[PDB]
Design a protein around this motif. Structure first.
Motif, PDB file in Angstrom:
ATOM      1  N   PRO A 166      39.262  35.733  48.959  1.00 47.68           N
ATOM      2  CA  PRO A 166      38.231  36.568  48.313  1.00 47.68           C
ATOM      3  C   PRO A 166      38.068  37.950  48.926  1.00 47.68           C
ATOM      4  O   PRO A 166      38.004  38.950  48.197  1.00 47.68           O
ATOM      5  CB  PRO A 166      36.980  35.709  48.469  1.00 47.68           C
ATOM      6  CG  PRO A 166      37.491  34.352  48.339  1.00 47.68           C
ATOM      7  CD  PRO A 166      38.796  34.339  49.054  1.00 47.68           C
TER       8      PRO A 166
ATOM      9  N   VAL B   5      40.983  45.411  45.125  1.00 47.21           N
ATOM     10  CA  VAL B   5      40.251  46.129  44.091  1.00 47.21           C
ATOM     11  C   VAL B   5      39.711  47.442  44.635  1.00 47.21           C
ATOM     12  O   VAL B   5      39.610  48.428  43.900  1.00 47.21           O
ATOM     13  CB  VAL B   5      39.132  45.246  43.513  1.00 47.21           C
ATOM     14  CG1 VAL B   5      38.274  46.032  42.537  1.00 47.21           C
ATOM     15  CG2 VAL B   5      39.733  44.040  42.811  1.00 47.21           C
TER      16      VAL B   5
ATOM     17  N   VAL C  22      50.125  50.389  43.782  1.00 47.24           N
ATOM     18  CA  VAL C  22      49.975  49.510  44.931  1.00 47.24           C
ATOM     19  C   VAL C  22      48.734  48.649  44.784  1.00 47.24           C
ATOM     20  O   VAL C  22      48.730  47.486  45.185  1.00 47.24           O
ATOM     21  CB  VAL C  22      49.944  50.337  46.229  1.00 47.24           C
ATOM     22  CG1 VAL C  22      49.451  49.503  47.402  1.00 47.24           C
ATOM     23  CG2 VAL C  22      51.315  50.879  46.529  1.00 47.24           C
TER      24      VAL C  22
ATOM     25  N   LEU D 194      45.244  33.344  46.142  1.00 42.66           N
ATOM     26  CA  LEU D 194      44.031  32.559  45.963  1.00 42.66           C
ATOM     27  C   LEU D 194      44.319  31.316  45.140  1.00 42.66           C
ATOM     28  O   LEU D 194      43.920  30.207  45.506  1.00 42.66           O
ATOM     29  CB  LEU D 194      42.962  33.420  45.290  1.00 42.66           C
ATOM     30  CG  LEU D 194      41.620  32.819  44.867  1.00 42.66           C
ATOM     31  CD1 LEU D 194      40.583  33.024  45.928  1.00 42.66           C
ATOM     32  CD2 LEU D 194      41.178  33.426  43.565  1.00 42.66           C
TER      33      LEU D 194
ATOM     34  N   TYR E 124      45.643  25.815  47.904  1.00 36.72           N
ATOM     35  CA  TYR E 124      45.659  24.387  48.184  1.00 36.72           C
ATOM     36  C   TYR E 124      46.879  23.696  47.613  1.00 36.72           C
ATOM     37  O   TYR E 124      46.807  22.511  47.272  1.00 36.72           O
ATOM     38  CB  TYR E 124      44.381  23.743  47.652  1.00 36.72           C
ATOM     39  CG  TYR E 124      43.143  24.397  48.192  1.00 36.72           C
ATOM     40  CD1 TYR E 124      42.852  24.346  49.542  1.00 36.72           C
ATOM     41  CD2 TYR E 124      42.276  25.083  47.360  1.00 36.72           C
ATOM     42  CE1 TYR E 124      41.739  24.947  50.049  1.00 36.72           C
ATOM     43  CE2 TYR E 124      41.154  25.689  47.859  1.00 36.72           C
ATOM     44  CZ  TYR E 124      40.890  25.614  49.208  1.00 36.72           C
ATOM     45  OH  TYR E 124      39.775  26.218  49.725  1.00 36.72           O
TER      46      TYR E 124
ATOM     47  N   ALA F  26      40.545  51.019  43.024  1.00 38.78           N
ATOM     48  CA  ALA F  26      39.485  51.883  42.527  1.00 38.78           C
ATOM     49  C   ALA F  26      39.555  53.266  43.159  1.00 38.78           C
ATOM     50  O   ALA F  26      39.332  54.271  42.481  1.00 38.78           O
ATOM     51  CB  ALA F  26      38.133  51.230  42.789  1.00 38.78           C
ATOM     52  N   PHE F  27      39.874  53.345  44.450  1.00 33.85           N
ATOM     53  CA  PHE F  27      40.031  54.660  45.063  1.00 33.85           C
ATOM     54  C   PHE F  27      41.252  55.389  44.521  1.00 33.85           C
ATOM     55  O   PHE F  27      41.224  56.619  44.371  1.00 33.85           O
ATOM     56  CB  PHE F  27      40.109  54.537  46.580  1.00 33.85           C
ATOM     57  CG  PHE F  27      38.768  54.544  47.249  1.00 33.85           C
ATOM     58  CD1 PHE F  27      38.052  55.716  47.372  1.00 33.85           C
ATOM     59  CD2 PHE F  27      38.217  53.382  47.744  1.00 33.85           C
ATOM     60  CE1 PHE F  27      36.819  55.725  47.977  1.00 33.85           C
ATOM     61  CE2 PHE F  27      36.987  53.392  48.352  1.00 33.85           C
ATOM     62  CZ  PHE F  27      36.290  54.564  48.467  1.00 33.85           C
TER      63      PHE F  27
ATOM     64  N   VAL G 226      40.047  56.811  41.277  1.00 29.80           N
ATOM     65  CA  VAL G 226      39.212  57.960  41.605  1.00 29.80           C
ATOM     66  C   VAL G 226      40.104  59.173  41.768  1.00 29.80           C
ATOM     67  O   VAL G 226      40.066  60.095  40.950  1.00 29.80           O
ATOM     68  CB  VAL G 226      38.390  57.695  42.880  1.00 29.80           C
ATOM     69  CG1 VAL G 226      37.879  58.987  43.508  1.00 29.80           C
ATOM     70  CG2 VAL G 226      37.233  56.779  42.562  1.00 29.80           C
ATOM     71  N   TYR G 227      40.930  59.173  42.813  1.00 29.55           N
ATOM     72  CA  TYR G 227      41.791  60.322  43.049  1.00 29.55           C
ATOM     73  C   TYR G 227      42.898  60.448  42.013  1.00 29.55           C
ATOM     74  O   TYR G 227      43.468  61.529  41.865  1.00 29.55           O
ATOM     75  CB  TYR G 227      42.390  60.230  44.442  1.00 29.55           C
ATOM     76  CG  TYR G 227      41.361  60.258  45.536  1.00 29.55           C
ATOM     77  CD1 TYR G 227      40.671  61.420  45.829  1.00 29.55           C
ATOM     78  CD2 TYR G 227      41.094  59.134  46.290  1.00 29.55           C
ATOM     79  CE1 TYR G 227      39.733  61.460  46.829  1.00 29.55           C
ATOM     80  CE2 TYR G 227      40.156  59.166  47.297  1.00 29.55           C
ATOM     81  CZ  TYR G 227      39.477  60.336  47.558  1.00 29.55           C
ATOM     82  OH  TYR G 227      38.537  60.388  48.558  1.00 29.55           O
TER      83      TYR G 227
ATOM     84  N   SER H  44      36.238  24.178  47.602  1.00 27.56           N
ATOM     85  CA  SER H  44      36.961  24.927  48.615  1.00 27.56           C
ATOM     86  C   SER H  44      36.139  24.996  49.901  1.00 27.56           C
ATOM     87  O   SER H  44      34.989  25.454  49.854  1.00 27.56           O
ATOM     88  CB  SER H  44      37.255  26.330  48.104  1.00 27.56           C
ATOM     89  OG  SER H  44      37.729  27.166  49.141  1.00 27.56           O
ATOM     90  N   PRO H  45      36.666  24.555  51.066  1.00 29.24           N
ATOM     91  CA  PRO H  45      35.881  24.695  52.302  1.00 29.24           C
ATOM     92  C   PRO H  45      35.942  26.083  52.922  1.00 29.24           C
ATOM     93  O   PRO H  45      35.025  26.474  53.648  1.00 29.24           O
ATOM     94  CB  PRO H  45      36.508  23.656  53.239  1.00 29.24           C
ATOM     95  CG  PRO H  45      37.350  22.814  52.400  1.00 29.24           C
ATOM     96  CD  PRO H  45      37.809  23.654  51.281  1.00 29.24           C
TER      97      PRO H  45
ATOM     98  N   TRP I 139      50.755  56.297  42.935  1.00 34.95           N
ATOM     99  CA  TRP I 139      51.184  55.268  43.870  1.00 34.95           C
ATOM    100  C   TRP I 139      50.025  54.373  44.280  1.00 34.95           C
ATOM    101  O   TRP I 139      50.222  53.177  44.498  1.00 34.95           O
ATOM    102  CB  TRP I 139      51.834  55.905  45.100  1.00 34.95           C
ATOM    103  CG  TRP I 139      50.862  56.506  46.045  1.00 34.95           C
ATOM    104  CD1 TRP I 139      50.387  57.765  46.022  1.00 34.95           C
ATOM    105  CD2 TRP I 139      50.226  55.860  47.149  1.00 34.95           C
ATOM    106  NE1 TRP I 139      49.499  57.959  47.031  1.00 34.95           N
ATOM    107  CE2 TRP I 139      49.382  56.803  47.747  1.00 34.95           C
ATOM    108  CE3 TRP I 139      50.288  54.575  47.685  1.00 34.95           C
ATOM    109  CZ2 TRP I 139      48.602  56.509  48.853  1.00 34.95           C
ATOM    110  CZ3 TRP I 139      49.523  54.286  48.779  1.00 34.95           C
ATOM    111  CH2 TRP I 139      48.687  55.247  49.355  1.00 34.95           C
TER     112      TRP I 139
ATOM    113  N   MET J   5      40.973  40.044  47.974  1.00 37.16           N
ATOM    114  CA  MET J   5      40.897  40.536  46.604  1.00 37.16           C
ATOM    115  C   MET J   5      39.947  41.713  46.496  1.00 37.16           C
ATOM    116  O   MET J   5      40.217  42.670  45.763  1.00 37.16           O
ATOM    117  CB  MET J   5      40.438  39.424  45.674  1.00 37.16           C
ATOM    118  CG  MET J   5      41.395  38.271  45.562  1.00 37.16           C
ATOM    119  SD  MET J   5      40.530  36.731  45.303  1.00 37.16           S
ATOM    120  CE  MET J   5      39.769  37.045  43.723  1.00 37.16           C
ATOM    121  N   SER J   6      38.816  41.652  47.196  1.00 31.93           N
ATOM    122  CA  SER J   6      37.913  42.797  47.202  1.00 31.93           C
ATOM    123  C   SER J   6      38.596  44.027  47.779  1.00 31.93           C
ATOM    124  O   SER J   6      38.401  45.142  47.288  1.00 31.93           O
ATOM    125  CB  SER J   6      36.657  42.480  47.998  1.00 31.93           C
ATOM    126  OG  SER J   6      36.895  42.626  49.385  1.00 31.93           O
ATOM    127  N   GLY J   7      39.413  43.847  48.813  1.00 26.65           N
ATOM    128  CA  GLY J   7      40.130  44.981  49.373  1.00 26.65           C
ATOM    129  C   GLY J   7      41.175  45.536  48.427  1.00 26.65           C
ATOM    130  O   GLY J   7      41.376  46.751  48.349  1.00 26.65           O
TER     131      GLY J   7
END
Ligand SMILES: CCCCCCCCCCC(=O)OC[C@H]1O[C@H](O[C@@H]2[C@H](O)[C@@H](O)[C@H](O)[C@@H](O[C@H]3O[C@H](CO[C@H]4O[C@H](CO[C@H]5O[C@H](CO)[C@@H](O)[C@H](O)[C@@H]5O[C@H]5O[C@H](CO)[C@@H](O)[C@H](O)[C@@H]5O)[C@@H](O)[C@H](O)[C@@H]4O)[C@@H](O)[C@H](O)[C@@H]3O)[C@@H]2OP(=O)(O)OC[C@@H](COC(=O)CCCCCCCC[C@H](C)CC)OC(=O)CCCCCCCCCC)[C@@H](O)[C@@H](O)[C@@H]1O
Ligand SMILES: CCCCCCCCCCCCCCCCCC(=O)OC[C@H](COP(=O)([O-])OCC(O)COP(=O)([O-])OC[C@@H](COC(=O)CCCCCCCCCCCCCCCCC)OC(=O)CCCCCCCCCCCCCCCCC)OC(=O)CCCCCCCCCCCCCCCCC
Ligand SMILES: CCCCCCCCCCCCCCCC(=O)OC[C@H]1O[C@H](O[C@@H]2[C@H](O)[C@@H](O)[C@H](O)[C@@H](O[C@H]3O[C@H](CO)[C@@H](O)[C@H](O)[C@@H]3O)[C@@H]2OP(=O)(O)OC[C@@H](COC(=O)CCCCCCCC[C@H](C)CCCCCCCCCCC)OC(=O)CCCCCCCCCC)[C@@H](O)[C@@H](O)[C@@H]1O
Ligand code: HAS
Ligand SMILES: CCCCCCCCCCCCCCCCCC(=O)OC[C@H](COP(=O)(O)OCCN)OC(=O)CCCCCCCCCCCCCCCCC
Ligand SMILES: CCCCCCCCCCCCCCCCCC(=O)OC[C@H](COP(=O)(O)OCCN)OC(=O)CCCCCCCCCCCCCCCCC
Ligand SMILES: CCCCCCCCCCCCCCCCCC(=O)OC[C@H](CO)OC(=O)CCCCCCCCCCCCCCCCC
Ligand code: HEC
Ligand code: HEC
Ligand SMILES: *C(=O)CCCCCCCCCCCCCCC
Ligand code: FES
Ligand code: CUA
Ligand SMILES: [Ca+2]
Ligand SMILES: [Mn+2]
Lengths: 331, 154, 54, 119, 153, 233, 63, 24, 143, 119
Positions: I96, I103, I120, I132, I136, I107-108, I111-112, I90-91, I116, I99-101
């Protein structure tokens, strides 16, 4: 270890800040400690000396100023030496492990024939002491003394199940307290007062630990020993009793909480005061006869100071301690 | 920022109608001091005296007076250390027990009302055989039986 | 499939009452937010005054 | 060691030695005396202690050298920042001379796919 | 009222009472009382303070005798843009406006300590009458509600 | 009975409450207040809802999982009530601790709508300022907040109104009579347990919820539709 | 050497000064301020020594 | 930039006392 | 890849040995500083750890037995033996970070414990992993 | 260094017990899980393909994902300090039952968990 350390200022350096120890097994541990530091300082000295030799002999400018050339001898393997230098550590740690097992087995034994058994309860954030057993030779009256308060122990025993049926933990209630100990003679620590556990000299003693909520730890630095006190120690398979063969000398000794337990963890101190055998018989007789009397009054009655001395209660005010004076005095 | 050396929780005081006097250093404390005047007519003083002197001197509550008016409080034996002398009007002490455990002592008490006003404040003197405390205290009605008293048009 | 203004849960208007999260609709929230962030800069000119919400 | 390979520039050796000696002195001054105060009976995670414990002087020495150890990162940050954009340029594949591993067989910095040729 | 409590009170003239010993089930006082409840500047909040908090109070000039023991009365309408300041924090003695988070100190004659309000909450003088009911000893000493160009101060 | 109850209460108090409230319930200066004169209602509300023991001082103690059984709670409440009384618990006519019978003054099997209609006005005047219409919660000064009224049972609603927990004002039975409190309970439990007729409530917060819903995901799905129908070149 | 000794002189004056102040303050909050002064003193001491340690055997030329 | 009629009272609260008349 | 596949049997044998030793020891041996009984955490942990190293060792061996003699597994390979294609890489990819956003939002929400937010976040996560994995292959636009 | 400042003298000069607990907990967590492990994987990412003679790593987008999920774990873990109660304060070991909700109810105690999970 049976062998005593070198002693003198050399011994003071070798034991590297450890108390002298007020029990026989504390003496054993301190001995073992000083000798393992003789060993450790030998290793450290010779290897730091090698790292200095690297600075002052194996340099490139020293080698070039005497004509050694561009490169050193490109040696990479010496199978015998890199075998020997591996086998020697093994036979070192095997001897260390032998002495370790000896000392650990002496300290950790439970066959010391205890004469006084104390039930210790930790909670957030103080201590409660109570005499579970006092065998007759020093007991009040001379008959072997059991300490249990049957009514209160029975209330704790009945708290093992919820009448409303909320019994989720293997059939038991979540707030079961039937593992805790309730005795007649007790001393209960407060924010205003340090709990002073009175014990006799030259007597084998048993301590029986547990916690009301969260893990705590029973560290007397003068015993050179600590153990964690847990809630429901038997569900955790945590051996809750330990025994000392004797306290060798009398005095007042601090003790601290040595496992993180929350906000006031650093304020959870107790005192272990050690008195004559007959003085302890008098103390326990006084407390057993007039159970309304407090701990300070009994301490005064046997001729000791009413309140702790090796430690003091903290000023509870959250700001008053700002300029250094964080201790509140007693009469 | 709220877990600081000044926090909201650590500042809070007892949500009760009475005042308090005594610190961590003082030998004898008073807690929840209030002049309880019934809506029928009876009056008295509610309070709890607490001995915490580390010299182990007992304190006997000798006398209590409210805006100079003497208080009748039934006989009380002295307050040893970590003992408590509870006091209210008898009608309200009949609604609670007197424990056999620890060291608590209930004593009824009563005032002859000179004409105090609800809502106001009056100075109350406690006098012990060792010393004295003075404290402002609000005049208030006693609590009701929970959940029985509806209001009516009249 | 989704409520938007349960007026029945709010009750009729009363000048003396109020709620905690009593916000306007989203397209007006910016104005309310302006009212919140403005400091208490108020002018007092003798018998007159220019309120902070100016 | 790998700043030249990463960037194509060297760092200032003098500022690096200042960083090293600050870190070394501050570190040993901070944590060597803690062995003694721990053996003497101080537990970890203690916000407050009493002046009767005998812990005060050890904590004072340790904190003084702790702030020294904290100052140690000031020459390090300055060295990284300065050398990143004004540092001595690397003209050789191996500016230390005697690189063993393969990363010194390629340029400083490597091209996008690492190797313009392999040995 | 208990020793840290808040009631919303309205002006009830004697001609609209119809309760207590003088209650008649044919006297129909409802619409006038609702007219009192639905006045814009009518709502007052009557606060009973703890004693130890009441003796920390700093009064305003000219308004030192407005209270009655531990009873204080403040206009419930905010001095910012007119919302009711109906959130009495019983322990901090802040009166909080839910609209734009103005905070008024009740132990400091209603003076703002946060938010966009600039003026102190007006205080009502109160007392008790011969029959033992709470009355308004006088009118407010200032205009009330939000500010306008014509309001002095 | 009552002396055995007071013994059990004292023993539980001595290993869970004595560090912040003192051995004689007098309070410790900056750790906790005096419990002299709080009553059985205060101990019931605080222990049963899980608020006590506090285990760190902050802006506000929070409702959490309870540490003591209801029987243990009543033992501790007996012991605390012996140190100067206070308001007590609401028992029903037979003697059981009152629960669903508090759902309005005219309760008889089901909630009556007149009780809900009066309790709605009482709640909207005395309570909703802090707890929002229909009790979803609200934010107070400096990290404090008015909780969500879902988790509380009827006894806890009544004792909250009596005891004035933390920054909550007190509402004696002379201020709000017994029937007015029971109607407030009826209103809380009607609104807490009636699904909205117009579909998903979106938390019942008010316009910010429907805002976020539309002004993110609603316009997003129609942008997706536009990208389906139109060209990306 | 040069600035080496200069640093070593200056830093000593700072360090001693902080040692004079940490005895005057003495457990208040300003004790921390005193310690920071002392740390800065020690820092400039080590800075001077580090300069010496570099000019004992430089690994770079000014070319 | 402050209201000119919003001062602290110079005189301090004197801790006064109340009463009510009565038949007896 | 012979040595790599084969050196996974050192730790496999060792961890299996320590598992059986620990098990028998904790159930039979007694000392005054612990209560006798099989300790289940360390038991399950060590046997599953030996399972992990067994898994890698066995799969890599079963592959090694049918791969040819590669130049990188040969002691005198010339540099020109791997000349040709090496593979696809992959260039660039924005997904990525996406995906981190996703997750992070999940996770938040956990937490709370806002429902919803959990919904989401899970939707975002399946979407971003899908995008992802379709990067291609997206069609050319047909207009 | 805040911890070392407050241990300088016996009383509590500017920190509370709670804030000191939060400080050592988060010092331990940040230094082990947001400095240590990510710098390990950063040095690996840079030099390892240069050492073995590869152009790329095997799974480039998974590498990118690892970086970003570690950053989000850091942000999540530190977000607890923005609450009024504050961060987690049970030590970086999170011993139980002190970590149960019954004994540590703040939201920071949840944030810490998901932080270490993301890392
Ligand atoms: C820079 C220059 C600024 C400029 O000039 O601005 C224009 C302004 O011009 C006009 O300003 C003048 C004046 O300068 C203002 O200061 C004043 O405010 C205006 O009058 C109102 O206040 C007067 C002052 O109150 C006093 O008391 C207040 C405190 O209150 C207590 O005490 C009061 C009495 O003391 C009681 O009332 C009150 O109840 C309360 O007491 C009770 O309650 C207490 C509890 O608190 C108890 O304790 C007590 O016991 C007791 O029971 C203080 O706050 C004050 O400061 C002050 O001390 C009152 O006396 C009045 O009654 C009235 O309310 C006044 O005007 P006027 O008299 O109406 O008219 C004169 C003339 C003016 O020109 C105009 O028409 C103006 C503009 C016209 C139209 C403009 C807009 C155009 C249209 C729009 C665009 C939309 C279509 O009009 C005329 O004929 C002329 C007509 C031709 C004009 C042509 C065009 C007003 O129109 C203002 O509105 C206006 O902004
Ligand atoms: C838990 C479930 C996790 C997800 C499913 C299982 C994952 C493995 C699947 C099989 C596999 O390896 O496929 C690779 C393979 C890629 O092959 P390729 O395209 O030829 O790639 C060659 C390139 O060189 C590839 O090079 P590249 O680096 O450019 O591409 C990286 C790419 C492909 O990477 C690989 O093929 C090699 C590595 C194996 C994949 C997994 C790597 C590790 C994932 C992150 C770290 C561990 C996460 C653990 C999470 C669980 C915690 C308990 O990584 C992924 O797609 C992995 C998914 C990302 C997960 C992130 C964590 C959340 O996948 C496919 O082609 C199939 C497409 C679909 C796969 C993903 C489906 C995800 C669906 C579930 C989403 C999560 C929500 C669940 C909700 C549950 C109900 C509420
Ligand atoms: C990296 C960041 C690390 C942050 C440090 C965390 C610890 C914070 C801390 O040390 O706070 C101390 C205490 O502050 C508050 O009380 C303050 C006084 O102490 C106290 O005597 C007063 O009584 C308080 O009076 C107010 O409060 C009353 C209620 O009682 C009200 O009647 C009214 O409000 C009154 O005025 C007073 O409050 P202020 O709000 O006025 O001042 C807060 C601020 C003031 O310090 C300074 O100027 C120092 C300047 C240096 C700053 C740089 O303190 C702090 O932040 C100081 C500590 C910061 C140092 C950290 C290192 C620097 C790095 C960050 C840039 C209280 O919140 C306590 O909880 C808390 O422990
Ligand atoms: C890799 C892992 C770790 C590293 C590295 C590390 C570094 C330090 N540690 Fe630590 N730590 C402690 C002290 C230090 C100090 C002083 C440093 C130093 O390295 C810190 C200095 C480093 C810095 C990077 C500071 C940067 C400085 C800045 C940003 C300011 C510079 C500006 C200044 C000074 C102003 C200029 C002034 C002028 C005059 C110019 C102490 C006690 O002193 C405890 C126990 C506490 C207790 O109560 O139990 C502790 C606890 C732990 C724990 C256990 C946590 C727990 O129990 O919950 C772990 C895992 C850990 C890891 C690590 N720790 N540490
Ligand atoms: C797609 C449609 C979804 C829908 O109608 O939502 C269900 C609705 C929501 O009700 P709810 O938002 O929970 O109101 C609580 C307010 N106190 O109502 C419900 O939750 C009840 C849905 C029952 C569906 C099964 C019977 C057919
Ligand atoms: C597919 C559907 C997914 C999207 C749903 C959006 C609606 C959010 C929602 O459900 O709000 C109610 C919710 C209550 O929480 P709940 O998830 O029901 O769980 C129990 C609480 N632990 O509430 C929450 O959990 C919190 C919601 C509050 C959101 C922030 C409010 C303040 C700031 C908003 C500013 C205005 C909106 C700006 C958005 C547009 C910007 C361009
Ligand atoms: C771009 C968006 C601009 C929006 C309009 C903001 C106007 C604020 C003027 C306040 C004047 C005032 O009422 O001033 C008077 C007021 C009294 O001043 C004070 O309270 C003293 C402090 C005043 C400080 C104001 C900010 C100064 C920097 C700009
Ligand atoms: C210190 C860590 C505490 C311990 C242990 C216990 N409580 Fe507490 N309590 C504490 C504080 C700081 C406060 C103030 C209000 C608040 O929520 O922060 C309280 C309050 C109470 C109350 C309410 C008192 C009132 O004014 O109505 C009660 C009834 C109470 N606490 C009881 C109680 C019991 C029974 C405890 C042992 C199980 C207990 N508390 C522990 C702080 C602390
Ligand atoms: C803001 C000034 C409030 C008003 C007005 C009312 N309440 Fe409240 N309430 C408030 C706070 C800050 C708290 C938290 C107290 C605590 O110690 O946690 C509460 C709590 C309650 C509860 C308990 C809910 C629970 O979690 O168990 C209930 C049931 C409750 N409040 C009800 C209630 C009612 C019915 C009110 C009007 C009569 C009311 N509150 C007023 C803040 C405020
Ligand atoms: C209030 O007292 C809350 C806790 C305060 C703790 C003070 C110490 C803070 C240390 C720095 C935290 C950095 C957090 C970064 C957030 C992104
Ligand atoms: S209306 Fe009250 S702060 Fe704005
Ligand atoms: Cu502890
Ligand atoms: Ca300090
Ligand atoms: Mn441990």
């Amino acid at each position: 270890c049976e062998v005593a350390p070198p002693g003198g200022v050399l011994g003071d350096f070798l034991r590297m800040g450890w108390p002298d120890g007020i029990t026989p097994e504390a003496v054993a541990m301190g001995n073992f400690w000083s000798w393992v530091w003789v060993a450790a300082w030998i290793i450290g000295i010779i290897m730091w000396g090698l790292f200095l030799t690297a600075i002052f002999a194996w340099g490139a400018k020293r080698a070039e100023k005497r004509g050694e050339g561009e490169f050193p001898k490109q040696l990479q393997y010496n199978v015998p030496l890199e075998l020997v230098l591996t086998i020697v550590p093994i036979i070192i740690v095997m001897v260390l492990f032998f002495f370790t097992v000896q000392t650990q087995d002496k300290v950790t034994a439970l066959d010391k024939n205890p004469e006084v058994t104390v039930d210790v309860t930790a909670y957030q954030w103080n201590w409660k002491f109570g005499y579970s057993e006092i065998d007759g030779s020093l007991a009040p009256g001379g008959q072997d003394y059991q300490g249990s308060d049957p009514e209160r122990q029975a209330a704790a025993e009945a708290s093992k199940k919820d009448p409303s049926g909320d019994n989720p933990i293997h059939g038991n209630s979540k707030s079961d307290v039937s593992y805790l100990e309730f005795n007649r003679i007790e001393t209960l620590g407060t924010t205003d007062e340090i709990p002073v556990m009175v014990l006799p000299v030259n007597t084998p003693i048993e301590f029986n630990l547990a916690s009301a909520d969260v893990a705590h730890s029973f560290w007397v630095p003068e015993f050179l020993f600590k153990r964690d006190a847990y809630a429901h120690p038997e569900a955790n398979k945590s051996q809750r009793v330990f025994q000392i063969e004797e306290i060798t000398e009398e005095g007042a000794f601090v003790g601290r909480c040595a496992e993180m337990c929350g906000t006031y963890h650093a304020m959870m101190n107790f005192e272990l005061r050690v008195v004559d055998r007959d003085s302890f018989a008098e103390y326990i007789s006084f407390r057993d006869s007039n159970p309304d009397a407090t701990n300070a009054q009994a301490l005064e009655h046997i001729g000791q100071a009413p309140y702790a001395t090796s430690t003091s209660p903290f000023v509870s005010d959250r700001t008053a301690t700002r300029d250094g004076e964080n201790t509140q005095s007693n009469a | 920022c709220s877990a600081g050396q000044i926090t909201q929780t650590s500042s809070q005081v007892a949500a009760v109608d009475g005042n308090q006097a005594g610190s961590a250093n003082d030998p004898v404390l008073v807690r929840d001091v209030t002049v309880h005047l019934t809506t029928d007519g009876e009056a008295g003083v509610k309070f709890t005296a607490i001995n915490q002197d580390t010299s182990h001197t007992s304190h006997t509550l000798e006398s209590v007076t409210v805006d100079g008016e003497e208080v009748e409080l039934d006989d009380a034996e002295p307050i040893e250390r970590n003992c408590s002398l509870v006091a209210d009007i008898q009608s309200e002490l009949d609604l609670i027990e007197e424990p056999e455990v620890g060291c608590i002592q209930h004593v009824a008490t009563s005032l002859e009302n000179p004409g105090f006003a609800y809502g106001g404040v009056v100075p109350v003197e406690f006098v012990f055989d060792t010393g004295a405390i003075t404290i402002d205290a609000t005049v208030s009605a006693p609590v009701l039986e929970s959940g029985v008293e509806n209001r009516e048009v009249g | 499939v989704t409520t938007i203004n349960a007026i029945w849960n709010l009750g009729p208007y009363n000048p003396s009452q109020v709620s905690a999260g009593s916000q306007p609709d989203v397209y007006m929230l910016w104005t309310d937010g302006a009212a919140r962030v403005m400091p208490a800069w108020e002018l007092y000119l003798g018998n007159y005054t220019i309120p902070a919400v100016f | 060691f790998w700043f030249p390979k990463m960037t194509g520039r060297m760092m200032d050796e003098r500022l690096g030695k200042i960083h090293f000696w600050l870190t070394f002195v501050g570190f040993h001054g901070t944590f060597l005396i803690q062995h003694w105060v721990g053996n003497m009976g101080m537990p970890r995670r203690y916000a407050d202690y009493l002046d009767s414990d005998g812990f005060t002087i050890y904590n004072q020495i340790s904190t003084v050298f702790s702030f020294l150890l904290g100052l140690s990162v000031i020459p390090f940050i300055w060295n990284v920042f300065k050398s990143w954009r004004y540092g001595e340029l690397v003209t050789v594949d191996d500016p230390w001379g005697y690189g063993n591993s393969l990363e010194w067989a390629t340029s400083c910095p490597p091209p996008r796919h690492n190797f313009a040729s392999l040995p | 009222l208990a020793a840290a409590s808040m009631e919303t009170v309205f002006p009830l003239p004697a001609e609209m009472v119809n309760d207590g010993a003088e209650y008649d089930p044919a006297k129909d006082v409802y619409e006038h009382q609702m007219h009192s409840v639905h006045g814009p500047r009518n709502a007052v909040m009557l606060i009973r303070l703890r004693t130890a908090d009441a003796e920390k109070v700093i009064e305003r000039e000219g308004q030192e005798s407005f209270h009655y023991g531990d009873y204080y009365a403040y206009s419930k309408i905010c001095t910012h843009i007119g919302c009711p300041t109906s959130l009495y924090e019983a322990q901090t003695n802040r009166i909080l406006c839910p609209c734009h988070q103005s905070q008024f100190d009740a132990l400091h004659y209603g003076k703002p300590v946060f938010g966009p309000a600039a003026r102190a909450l007006p205080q009502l003088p109160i007392t008790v009458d011969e029959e033992g009911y709470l009355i308004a000893a006088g009118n407010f000493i200032e205009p009330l509600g939000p500010a306008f160009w014509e309001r002095k101060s | 009975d009552d002396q055995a109850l007071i013994s059990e209460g004292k023993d539980l108090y001595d290993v869970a409450c004595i560090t912040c409230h003192g051995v004689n319930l007098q309070g410790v200066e900056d750790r906790g207040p005096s419990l002299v004169g709080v009553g059985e209602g205060a101990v019931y509300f605080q222990v049963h809802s899980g608020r006590m023991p506090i285990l760190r001082n902050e802006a506000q103690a929070e409702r959490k999982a309870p540490r003591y059984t209801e029987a243990q709670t009543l033992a501790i409440a007996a012991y605390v009530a012996a140190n100067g009384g206070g308001p007590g618990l609401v028992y029903n006519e037979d003697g059981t601790l009152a629960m669903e019978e508090l759902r309005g003054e005219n309760y008889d099997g089901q909630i009556t709508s007149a009780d809900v209609a009066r309790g709605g006005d009482l709640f909207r005047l005395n309570c909703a300022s802090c707890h929002n219409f229909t009790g979803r919660g609200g934010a107070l000064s400096s990290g404090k907040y008015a909780p969500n009224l879902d988790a509380a049972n009827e006894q806890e609603i009544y004792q909250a109104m009596l005891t004035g927990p933390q920054n909550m004002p007190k509402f004696s039975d002379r201020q709000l009579s017994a029937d007015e409190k029971k109607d407030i309970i009826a209103f809380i439990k009607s609104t807490k347990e009636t699904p909205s007729p117009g579909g998903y409530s979106l938390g019942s917060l008010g316009p910010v919820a429907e805002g976020l819903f539309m002004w993110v995901f609603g316009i997003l799905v129609l942008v997706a539709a536009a990208m389906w129908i139109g060209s990306r070149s | 050497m040069g600035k080496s000794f200069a640093l070593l002189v200056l830093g000593a004056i700072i360090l001693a000064g902080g040692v004079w102040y940490t005895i005057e303050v003495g457990y208040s909050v300003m004790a921390i301020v005193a310690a920071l002064i002392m740390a800065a003193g020690g820092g400039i001491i080590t800075w001077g020594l580090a300069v010496a340690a570099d000019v004992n055997s430089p690994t770079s030329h000014k070319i | 930039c402050s209201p000119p009629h919003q001062q602290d009272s110079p005189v301090q609260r004197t801790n006064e006392i109340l009463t009510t008349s009565q038949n007896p | 890849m012979k040595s790599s596949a084969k050196l996974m049997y050192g730790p496999t044998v060792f961890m299996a040995a320590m598992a059986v030793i620990y098990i028998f020891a904790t159930m039979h041996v007694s000392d005054g500083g612990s209560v006798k009984g099989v300790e289940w955490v360390g038991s399950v942990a060590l046997v599953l750890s030996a399972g992990l190293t067994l898994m890698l060792g066995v799969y890599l061996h079963f592959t090694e037995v049918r791969v040819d003699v590669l130049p990188e597994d040969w002691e005198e390979a010339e540099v020109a033996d791997k000349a040709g294609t090496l593979g696809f890489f992959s260039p660039s990819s924005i997904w990525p970070a996406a995906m981190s956003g996703a997750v992070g939002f999940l996770a938040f929400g956990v937490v709370y414990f806002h429902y919803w937010m959990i919904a989401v976040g899970l939707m975002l996560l399946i979407f971003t992993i899908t995008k992802l994995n379709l990067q291609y292959g997206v069609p050319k636009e047909k207009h | 260094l805040l911890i070392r400042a407050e241990l300088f003298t016996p009383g509590l000069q500017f920190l509370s017990n709670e804030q000191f607990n939060q400080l050592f907990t988060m010092h331990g967590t940040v230094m082990l899980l947001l400095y240590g492990t990510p710098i390990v994987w950063g040095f690996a990412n840079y030099v390892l393909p240069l050492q073995i003679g590869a152009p790329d790593v095997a799974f480039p987008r998974l590498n990118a994902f690892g970086f970003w999920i570690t950053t989000v774990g850091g942000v999540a873990m530190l977000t607890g300090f923005l609450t009024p109660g504050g961060a987690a304060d049970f030590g970086w070991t999170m011993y139980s039952p002190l970590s149960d909700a019954i004994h540590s109810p703040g939201l920071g105690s949840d944030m810490w968990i998901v932080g270490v999970g993301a890392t």
